[PDB]
Amino acid sequence: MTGKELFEMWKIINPMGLLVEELKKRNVSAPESRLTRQSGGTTALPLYFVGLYCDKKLIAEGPGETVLVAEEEAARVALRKLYGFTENRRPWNY
Amino acid sequence: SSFSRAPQQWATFARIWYLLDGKMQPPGKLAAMASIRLQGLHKPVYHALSDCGDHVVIMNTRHIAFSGNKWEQKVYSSHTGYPGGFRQVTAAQLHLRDPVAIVKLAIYGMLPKNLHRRTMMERLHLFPDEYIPEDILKNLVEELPQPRKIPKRLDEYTQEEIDAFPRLWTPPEDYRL
Amino acid sequence: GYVPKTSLSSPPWPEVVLPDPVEETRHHAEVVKKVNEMIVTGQYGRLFAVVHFASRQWKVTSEDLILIGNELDLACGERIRLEKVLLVGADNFTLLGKPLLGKDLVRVEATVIEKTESWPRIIMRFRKRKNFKKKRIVTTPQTVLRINSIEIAPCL
Amino acid sequence: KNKTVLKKRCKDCYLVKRRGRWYVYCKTHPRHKQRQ
Amino acid sequence: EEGPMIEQLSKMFFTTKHRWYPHGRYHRCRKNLNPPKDR
Amino acid sequence: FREVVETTIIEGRITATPKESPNPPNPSGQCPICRWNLKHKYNYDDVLLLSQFIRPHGGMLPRKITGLCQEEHRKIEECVKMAHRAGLLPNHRPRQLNRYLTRWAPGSVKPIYKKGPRWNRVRMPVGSPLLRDNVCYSRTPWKLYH
RNA sequence: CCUACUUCACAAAGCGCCUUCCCCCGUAAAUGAUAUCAUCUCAACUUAGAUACCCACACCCAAGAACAGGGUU
Ligand SMILES: [Zn+2]
């Protein structure tokens, strides 16, 4: 699991719901899904960069070709952040 | 970063649309920037093989300015195939015929001579006026600022500025002008 | 020695006013302290290091592979402490030396995986019309290091 | 007539610079009209 | 229909016609089907 | 400044002396430009200065009325001309291509129909060669020929 | 392009008939600065100063080497 990030290992469907559940468990709140940036859109090669805000503070933010996809990505990122992963992680002691 | 792989990759690449207003600017001073953008040399990801070029919208190209006497002096010169088909045209004339042309030519010259040049040119969007199409406007992200600063004529300077500036000499009270 | 407002009276560039050195020093100290605190807390997550090995500079992290084109004269599986970590960075803070960081601050560890030869590389000379045609095949020896760990300390 | 060195022949003659070249014009003696 | 289709593609994607025209057999044979993938 | 007033009758009327600016920074200079310290620190850009040595219909004023050193006077004139060419003195007039830095009048320049080989090539003049000693400031000098 | 003529003859020619649509740049001349007159102005200025065509099996042909094109009521 050195290179392999989560979601490759534990594959899932509908991360938004999961996030919501996790949020509830944690803070007793629900996330808004704002759209941070977008080049294209009508071009046929857009770059929708979509956030996820909780009480006017972004917990995560992800990219995508389409808006739904972007949202999904953001959700995934949020999940990763929650579950002590990310690309950063910590090296692990051997 | 976080992110899954493909989406990250997409984010890294993805063609951004940029805007340039002409109006009083020199072509080629526009084109330097535009050419760079087209190439994708403004990205730290740049390679000739990767295809990282962005879109450049340029507007108000009818309101280009030329430095010195280039409107009258600068000759754009091309051949048809045909004997006696050597056409030389002064920049002004060219502009009058097609206002998009001058900027475009400059951009072309700036770009590397490889086959990608024409593809790069297709990501260039030139307009003679403020009227850009709707799709293109939707696409746009950021205007990078104009090279030439615009000198500002006396009508625009306002009174306060004038007051601030000193009057350097006394005329004779008997002088007409 | 005054000039009224024109295009060439004042500079094109804006005038920067660099701050007072005592205050600046204090600020720097504060920053350092913060960094130290962070280090203590384990608030970081994965480090990287620009290390200097075999005249090349390498941005390196835990778990990565590096290929050095020469013999190190080490048995494989031996562990190495790489000196000359001239950059050590992470999310939220970075440390650069002048040019090298101190040994107390940081250390990078590397296990030698394998010692090998390169694929055969062809040298070949030629000149027109002058019967000059040489051909030498070479295999430059190589070593593969696996960087295991970047330890970073609270010395600052 | 064309000349690289323009000279006034008469007092009525005058040098003018027009169209990026120096000319000599005289209202009395139009012979002395010269170009650069 | 071919040319029209090509034109449409170009319009969509902002690029020249030349890439959409289908390249020959030799070239395709040459192409690496299992390239060395990394990371 | 005086003015002729005609209706036959003719009269003369005086109105509003500029009266200088109060106290120059370098006094005991010989000129309006010289005293202040704009020896090499003006251009066509700056029209608040140029308009001071200009007639109501855009022409220059003479050296003897302004009181400018001759070398400077010429420069000033050139600047004024440039400004006019640009379109920076619209309220100064006798009674479509954008422009700046024009040394020659637009009419009176024949096109560079045969720019020669690079070792003897024809160049389009941009700006005046009077304004060389103008403060270049950047590490390269002014490219007066394009 | 072929109604006569002529070469000719279900056509194709000329010796026959028909149609043919813009500028041009050197100078000349006002007002007018630098240089309070004057001066055509590489001073600011004012005068003399592109439309048309083109674009949706078979058999015969004013279409044609083949290919293509037109017609087949
Ligand atoms: Zn002086």
Helix count from the secondary structure assignment of chain D: 0
Rounded to an integer, what's the Rg of chain D over CA atoms? 9 Å
Multimeric status of the protein: part of a larger assembly
Number of helices of chain A: 2
Most strands sheet of chain D: 2 strands, antiparallel
The total count of strands of chain A amounts to 3
Lateral strand order in the biggest sheet of chain D: 1-2
Task: Report the radius of gyration of chain A as a whole number of Å.
Answer: 14 Å
Name every ligand kind in the structure: zinc ion
Strand content bin of chain D: 25-35%
- Largest beta sheet of chain A, briefly? 3 strands, antiparallel
Strand content of chain A: 15-25%
Structural class of chain A: alpha+beta
Distance between the termini of chain A: 14 Å
- Biggest interface, chains and residue tallies: B-F, 39 and 55 residues
Protein name (chain C): Large ribosomal subunit protein bL21m
GO molecular function (chain C): RNA binding; structural constituent of ribosome
Family (chain C): Belongs to the bacterial ribosomal protein bL21 family.
GO cellular component, one term (chain C): mitochondrial large ribosomal subunit
Task: Sum up the structure in keywords.
part of a larger assembly; 6 chains; A: 94 residues; alpha+beta; 3-stranded antiparallel β-sheet; 2 helices; 20% strand; F: 146 residues; two-stranded antiparallel sheet; 4 helices; binds zinc ion; RNA-binding; Large ribosomal subunit protein bL36m (chain D); Ribosomal_uL13_CS (chain B)
Account of the protein in words:
This is part of a larger assembly, with chains A (94 residues), B (177 residues), C (156 residues), D (36 residues), E (39 residues) and F (146 residues). Helices cover 30% and strands 20% of the residues of chain A. Chain A is α+β, with helices and mostly antiparallel strands. In chain A, strands 1-2-3 form a 3-stranded antiparallel beta sheet, with helices on one face. In chain A, a hairpin with a 4-residue loop joins strand 2 and strand 3. Chain B is an alpha/beta fold. Chain B has one domain: Alpha-Beta Complex (Ribosomal Protein L13p, Chain: A), CATH 3.90.1180. In chain B, strands 1-2-6 form a 3-stranded parallel beta sheet. Chain B has a two-stranded antiparallel ribbon with strand order 4-5. Chain B starts with a helix and ends in a 13-residue tail after the last helix. The N and C termini of chain D lie close together (9 Å). By secondary structure, chain D is mainly β. Classes of the chains: A alpha+beta (94), B alpha/beta (177), C mainly beta (156), D mainly beta (36), E mainly alpha (39), F alpha+beta (146). Chains in contact: A-B, A-C, A-E, B-C, B-E, B-F, C-F, D-F. Zinc ion is lined by residues 29-31, 33-34, 69, 72 of chain F. Chain F binds one RNA strand of 73 nucleotides through helix 3 and helix 4.
